[PDB]
From Swiss-Prot:
Segments forming a coiled coil: none
UniProt gene name: hypA
UniProt cross-references to Pfam families, sorted A to Z: HypA
Name listed for the protein in its UniProt record: Hydrogenase maturation factor HypA
InterPro entries for the chain: Hydgase_Ni_incorp_HypA/HybF_CS (IPR020538), HypA/HybF (IPR000688)
Top-rank taxon, per record: Bacteria
Family from the record: Belongs to the HypA/HybF family.
Residue positions binding Ni(2+): 2
Residues where Zn(2+) binds: 74, 77, 91, 94
Organism for this UniProt entry: Helicobacter pylori (strain J99 / ATCC 700824) (Campylobacter pylori J99)
Keyword annotations from UniProtKB, A to Z: Metal-binding, Nickel, Zinc
GO terms, biological process: protein maturation; protein modification process
Amino acid sequence: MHEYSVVSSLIALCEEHAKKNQAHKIERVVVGIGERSAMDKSLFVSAFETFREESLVCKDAILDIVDEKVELECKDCSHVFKPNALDYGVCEKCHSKNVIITQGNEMRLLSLEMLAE
Ligand SMILES: [Zn+2]
């Protein structure tokens, strides 16, 4: 969740995808960060520059961020959905307290531009 820890995880994640795609160099990494996320985009793009130099694979990668809407799950109520109103923070099937954000709380990878080995 903390920005430098997520980016350090991201560079390794970029490398594993490079192994999985049989690619040696990534030119662009695009991510999705939730609109109500527990993350700071300003430090995220600074941390990305700080860690990308550590690896040849990610060194020249262009970083782009897409803002995404949160997704919610209700503690056992079968409900996972994207909220559509100011009713964020509760389920809509019931309006029970104690629902949790499943997506949009932390960063996700959307696409990578890559050069084959
Ligand atoms: Zn519910």
